[PDB]
Amino acid sequence: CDDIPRYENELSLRLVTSTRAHAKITSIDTSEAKKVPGFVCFLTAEDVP
Amino acid sequence: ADELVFFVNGKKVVEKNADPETTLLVYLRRKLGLCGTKLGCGEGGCGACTVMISKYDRLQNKIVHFSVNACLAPICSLHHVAVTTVEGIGNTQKLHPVQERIARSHGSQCGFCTPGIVMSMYTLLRNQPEPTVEEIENAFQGNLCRCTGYRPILQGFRTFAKDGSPSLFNPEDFKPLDPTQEPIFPPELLRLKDTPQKKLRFEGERVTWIQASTMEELLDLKAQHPDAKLVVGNTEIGIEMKFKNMLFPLIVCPAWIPELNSVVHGPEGISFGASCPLSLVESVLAEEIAKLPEQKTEVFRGVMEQLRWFAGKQVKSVASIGGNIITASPISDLNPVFMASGAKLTLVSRGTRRTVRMDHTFFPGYRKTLLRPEEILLSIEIPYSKEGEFFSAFKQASRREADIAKVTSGMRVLFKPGTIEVQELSLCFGGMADRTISALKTTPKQLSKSWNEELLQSVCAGLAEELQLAPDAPGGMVEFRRTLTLSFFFKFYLTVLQKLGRADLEDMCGKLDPTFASATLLFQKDPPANVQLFQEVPKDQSEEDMVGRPLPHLAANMQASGEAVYCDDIPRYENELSLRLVTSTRAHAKITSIDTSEAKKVPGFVCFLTAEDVPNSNATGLFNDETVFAKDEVTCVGHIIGAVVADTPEHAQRAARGVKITYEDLPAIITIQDAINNNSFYGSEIKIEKGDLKKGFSEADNVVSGELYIGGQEHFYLETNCTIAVPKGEAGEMELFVSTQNTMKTQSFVAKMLGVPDNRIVVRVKRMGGGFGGKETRSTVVSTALALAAHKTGRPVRCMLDRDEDMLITGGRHPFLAKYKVGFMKTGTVVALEVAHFSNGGNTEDLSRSIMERALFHMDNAYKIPNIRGTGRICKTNLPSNTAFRGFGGPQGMLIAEYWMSEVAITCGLPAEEVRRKNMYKEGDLTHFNQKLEGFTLPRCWDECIASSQYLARKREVEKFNRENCWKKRGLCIIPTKFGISFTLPFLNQGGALVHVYTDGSVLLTHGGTEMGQGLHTKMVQVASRALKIPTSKIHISETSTNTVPNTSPTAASASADLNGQGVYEACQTILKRLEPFKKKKPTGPWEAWVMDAYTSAVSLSATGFYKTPNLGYSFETNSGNPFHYFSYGVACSEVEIDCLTGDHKNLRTDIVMDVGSSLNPAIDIGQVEGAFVQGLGLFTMEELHYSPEGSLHTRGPSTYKIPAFGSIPIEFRVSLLRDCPNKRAIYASKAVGEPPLFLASSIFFAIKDAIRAARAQHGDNAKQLFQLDSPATPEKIRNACVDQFTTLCVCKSWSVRI
Amino acid sequence: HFYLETNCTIAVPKGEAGEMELFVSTQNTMKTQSFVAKMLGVPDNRIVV
Amino acid sequence: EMGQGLHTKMVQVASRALKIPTSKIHISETSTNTVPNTSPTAASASADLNGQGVYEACQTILKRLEPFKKKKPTGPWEAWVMDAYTSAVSLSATGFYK
Ligand SMILES: Cc1cc2nc3c(=O)[nH]c(=O)nc-3n(C[C@H](O)[C@H](O)[C@H](O)COP(=O)(O)OP(=O)(O)OC[C@H]3O[C@@H](n4cnc5c(N)ncnc54)[C@H](O)[C@@H]3O)c2cc1C
Ligand SMILES: O=c1[nH]c(=O)c2[nH]c(=O)[nH]c2[nH]1
Ligand SMILES: O=c1[nH]c(=O)c2[nH]c(=O)[nH]c2[nH]1
Ligand code: FES
Ligand code: FES
Ligand SMILES: [Ca+2]
Ligand SMILES: [Ca+2]
DSSP states (O other): OTTSOOBTTOOOOOOOOOSSSSOOOOOOOOHHHHTSTTOOOOOOGGGOO | OOOEEEEETTEEEEETTOOTTOBHHHIIIIISOOTTSOOSOSSSSSOTTEEEEEEEETTTTEEEEEEEEGGGOBGGGOTTOEEEOGGGTOBTTBOOHHHHHHHHTTOOSSOSSHHHHHHHHHHHHHHOSSOOHHHHHHTTTTOOOSSSOSHHHHHHHGGGOTTOOOOSOOGGGSOOOOGGGSOOOOHHHHHHTTSOOOOEEEEOSSOEEEEOOSHHHHHHHHHHOTTOEEOSSOTTHHHHHHHSOOOOSEEEEOTTOGGGGOEEEOSSEEEEETTOBHHHHHHHHHHHHHHSOGGGOHHHHHHHHHHHTSSOHHHHTTOBHHHHHHHOOTTOSSHHHHHHTTOEEEEEETTEEEEEEOOGGGOOSTTOOSOOTTOEEEEEEEEOOOTTEEEEEEEEOSSSSSOOOSEEEEEEEEEOTTSSBEEEEEEEEESSSSSOEEOTTTSGGGTTOBSSHHHHHHHHHHHHHHSOOOTTOTTOOHHHHHHHHHHHHHHHHHHHHHHHHHTTOHHHHOOOOTTTGGGGOOOOOOOOEEEEEOOOOOTTSOTTOOTTSOOOOTTHHHHHHTOSOOGGGSOOBTTOEEEEEEEOSSSSEEEEEEEOTTGGGSTTEEEEEOGGGOSSOOEESTTSOEESSOOSEEOSTTOEEEEEEESSHHHHHHHHHTOEEEEEEOOOOOSHHHHHHTTOBSSSOEEEEESOHHHHHHHOSEEEEEEEEEOOBOOOOSSOOEEEEEEOSSTTOEEEEEOOSOHHHHHHHHHHHHTOOGGGEEEEESOOSOOTTTTSSTTHHHHHHHHHHHHHHSSOEEEEOOHHHHHHHSOOBOOEEEEEEEEEOTTSOEEEEEEEEEEEOOSSOTTHHHHHHHHHHTTTTTBOOSSEEEEEEEEOOSSOOOOOOTTTTHHHHHHHHHHHHHHHHHHHTSOHHHHHHHHBOOTTOBOTTOOBOOSOOHHHHHHHHHHHTTHHHHHHHHHHHHHHOSSEEEEEEEEEEEEEESOSSGGGOEEEEEEEEOTTSOEEEEESOOOSSSOHHHHHHHHHHHHHTSOGGGEEEOOEETTTSOSOOOSOTTOHHHHHHHHHHHHHHHHHHHHHHHHHHSSSSOHHHHHHHHHHTTOOOEEEEEEEOOSOOOBTTTTBSOSOSEEEEEEEEEEEEEETTTOOEEEEEEEEEEEOBSOSOHHHHHHHHHHHHHHHHHHHHTOOOOBOTTSOBOOOSTTTSOOOOGGGSOSEEEEEEOSSOOOTTSGGGBOOOSSTTGGGGHHHHHHHHHHHHHHHHHHOSSOOSSOOOOBSOOHHHHHHHSOSHHHHHHOOOOSOBOO | OOOSSOOOEEEEEOSSTTOEEEEEOOSOHHHHHHHHHHHHTOOGGGEEO | OOSSOHHHHHHHHHHHHHTSOGGGOOOOOOOTTTSOSOOOSOTTOHHHHHHHHHHHHHHHHHHHHHHHHHHSTTSOHHHHHHHHHHTTOOOOOOOOOO
16 A cells, blocks of 8 residues: 555645543644644544534 | 745745746646646637636726636736636535536536636626626637537526526526625735835746836846847737747746836827737727717727627737737738728837837738837827728638638728718738738729729729739638638728718718618627427426436536546646657658657656557557557658657657657658549448439439538547556556546557556546547547556656647548439439448548448438449548547438438429428338338428428528528528437447445446546436436446446447446346345335345345347348447428628527437437537538648647637527437437437538528529539638629639648 | 554545545455445445445 | 465466466456445455355356357357457356355
């Protein structure tokens, strides 16, 4: 699969995972991510169609 | 400065390295990935690339909106504007009203023209939210469609207009337009309208562009660097660059400068800055014409009349008045008007200013003016007319709308006050020399003459001697062009008599004879009136069974939104390369050597592929007589010699120019006569004969012999040929995405060239933007080249042909020459017929012999002929190979039949409809090839058409018009057709499908047929939904692919719904048989329960389906066995009004009755009837290809090749599908429809021939009774056949030869 | 498991009718298709794995 | 295919079933749009299940070719196939097993 050439407009995705065994998610802050060059979006449960 | 900053769909674009050579079309598609805007021609004629521009106009102080051709708009001209594309107005989640209406009204077939037409309509609405019907039609003068026949587009959009059987759509369900919901004008651009504009400089690979902010800067630049090339609209410079390979390394754009954009009203006229667009000239002059006295606006009206027919909205929004003047084209429509009116031009340079009156010295030589190199044109003053000064302007082209003049003229006379005595006379012409000319030797002689018949004869004699053309004049048509100069003067002569009459000088100059009045009328059409009649389905049919219902094409919403993906719209891989074909510039020659040294220097060059690089076989083509790449010799102009591979299409094009070929000429065979002289044919004579010819001719009362020539036809699919080949790096596997009707032959030809098994090669077709037969085989000459490139490099490679390459390489319909002899009785009954057909096949066999077989199978058209002999021979020539075109030989065979049939009636002195009727077959009769005519509905179509068209009463009105008009004539004809359905090669009548039902109940269907706009997937989803008894919403077709259904026939022969519809039905019946136990246990539980129960019982939910048409196979040796499964029938009656002085005509009304059996889908079928009919209207009256005597195609783009335009179609256009005529042997009792209607447009050709006959009766001096009308009957042929006092005055190296 | 190639998907949207093709290192094309289609709320006939 | 040589085994099975060499048969990929509703490749069972499916698809092709093989008992495979195509006989088939 990863040997297939990328399209010129292809994007890359990285999963964000829990660092706790069992917790409520109290909040999520994406300010720092939004400053990284090339950032497009952070998908969460609210984006599921 | 430096950055180029503009907005697209409301998003800011900041381009830090703009190249002056980059068009907005390339920037949208390739930089921003917005592929809804399409390339259809790259030369401004087709509108497929239309987008809207918005800007803050600093001169008028307001936001303005206008449309442009993105293919010709340099991005460097667009600083601080806002572009809107089709994606910017709506998408399938929220369609704009314009998108919704064109899709729901069946205005989108192939869909490739849809976004451009949507953007033309959208821009009109942004400017005028309540347009008139007339304004709506005018919005599309710059837009072409090859599929729909235009009617449904105009009908759907009439719902926007101020003054605007079941139904094909319901306008009552269209959502209303809310103008407040349009995209905001970008707020930065409003802030920036404050700050002053500064000069910008952009530097590309080869070109520097300066956007000049002030006159001072422009004149300083031009004084320092007089070579700096001015660019305003780029509508001429873009063509020089793209097509004449002209490279101007320094451009200056002065469009921002207020002095070049001003409009000032003076005592003698109105002065326009030289950069004012023609759209602003039109709005200004129209306002003046509406409020000033007629006596002052004669010259303004002459300019307006020329602007009527000057391109369309996209060109006129950016084309400048100064740019037309300085261009100095021999065919400028405006320069003859400015020369005749002595328009005042102001010229400036740094430190200088002068004023000249335009006259003959202004244009001293080909494309030259009297400007100095440092000078620019500042302004032109268009003058008021004086008392006793009258003006006319004229243009005649090959098509009325959006064409290049063949002859264009401005004519002005000024009389001595209170007399009819000439004080000044100026007659100026384009199209008659290498520059705009004045008839300076003729006009002085008329000074002091009274406006009378002797002045008319003197001027005509003067022009006929003064405006000579050599036999070799570029463009040919020398007799027609000279005849037009005199005919235009006659019109002016009569107009001036009328104007003298209105000034109360009728006693001095005489009244105009009322039979002459219609000669001087300016062109006007009645508003359109259309009828579509079809049959409702039974009342008991379920609402979920869509068979026979008018379901819109399944992709129409996505086509209207630009979201439907065609081949070149697919994103490129990061490592993808571009391929450009290198073709022969000689008709027949040895290749002595090839030099690629310049090509190797182009940045991004990869390699030049030739015959030596072919891994396995260089022999390709349907009959294995074609090269992949030429070896040792070339055999036509356009013969592919090799292919350049580079990183980008620009680098590949530039590298292709540096491939230098040296040739040694060999004897060329170009024409049908050359071929006959050299015995150069494809195979032997083909022949069908029945009865006893000797006997029939001896018994005939009368015998008539003659010949007919029928020109060929370019398909002009709006999407040209395109292939992407993706190598997989394993086992020779490759996947190709191709715009083709023939996935099986594409796969076979690629596999053979490579030397790998067919199982390694996959060919996928999602859709084509039109095919029409041109992509049945000829697509492969691109696919094989691109596949070799991908194999050699291991990289994906793409090629989409430019229109000029596609028209030159891929061939067309076959020209036919036929010699006939027909025997018949005084009653009009035909008793004997012998016809010899010859076709021009070009340089490979391809489908030419089957095309000739079909012409011979239809040489009877609708008529029973007891003694008959037809032969055909296919000429082998040094021209591009001709191929399938919708009709496939049928239209040529049947035009010849109707042509001698027309002569039969005239020779007998009997009404043509009676002669055709009494020769018609009857039910049960055998054709000349011995096939019985069963289910023969032709007589019903004939009676319904003749009744519903009121053909008899209309004959009376045509005769009355002709007796009351000398210089315009009407004609009326009704023509039948019979068209045999099935491939002539019996085994190609087979189809396959594959269906899967997933565990959610949803159904994925595919079949061998390919979608090219004909709505085949829509029909197959309709069929599968009836067969499965589930809603169409549960079934989807994604694509056609050789690895889902193998060994498929091409989508051709009008047969693909019949063949694939049966395959689909059988695959669905297999699924239903497996679900039957589950339906029995749960007779009510839904489809989804049956499916899940089958799955968890381990029952297969996938099946193939297959069909072959039974009982086919004709022998030419025994004249027995059936070539066809059944026949299509239909009749069309059409009326025309010809202009006997110019050769132009109006298509006044056409009524068609078509047998489509029990239509699977009447919306799509009516669309097929209208689209096929309009392509036949183009074949028989407008479309012509010209070739040099050395075999080089001259006609290579829509500027020269004139397909029907929105304004070409019959004004009253009525189409009825025959009722109660089920055809039980094809799927759900339907009939094929794609090709049979096209020949019905011969009703227009014969109405024209009737009108010419009436003109020859009026003015001919004992003219030949059986006069020749070859096809196409263009304005040239019509005008030359209308022999009169003007033609008689105007009577071997040349520009073209007849092929 | 320590498969030497870790999990990998490329998803290629086609822009039409919810259609999408996915190239996946998976033993289960059918559940990959089903799960993608349920998340998006499109039928299984639009999703090719 | 995950390294277990399933496609190699299915090519071996198709070549026996059709009586042509393995060189004439190719598997390029697995896709939900050529065979739907498939179980995971798991439970060691995939050559058992797909090898029967493959065998049945090949038996269907051979039944279709049998009249051509009768008319031409030695003429090669390529001839029976082209005779079948030009007689308008389908050369595609599904196979299934439970
Ligand atoms: C699809 C299409 C249809 C067309 N139809 C017609 C038609 O029916 N009739 C017709 O007559 N033409 C037609 N044309 C030709 C063209 O549109 C006109 O000649 C147009 O007026 C050129 O204006 P422009 O602003 O685009 O010129 P540009 O291409 O920008 O420049 C044209 C020439 O004028 C020069 N120039 C521009 N302004 C000045 C100035 N102020 N001083 C000195 N030099 C200047 C340029 O240097 C260049 O040599 C058509 C063109 C297209 C693409
Ligand atoms: O009899 C036909 N055979 C074809 O291969 C073909 N192609 C086409 O466009 N019409 C036809 N008609
Ligand atoms: O009985 C089994 N079911 C499975 O789904 C499975 N998966 C696997 O790896 N082994 C097994 N065995
Ligand atoms: S592509 Fe621009 S007008 Fe044809
Ligand atoms: S629908 Fe207009 S060109 Fe095809
Ligand atoms: Ca073509
Ligand atoms: Ca040919």
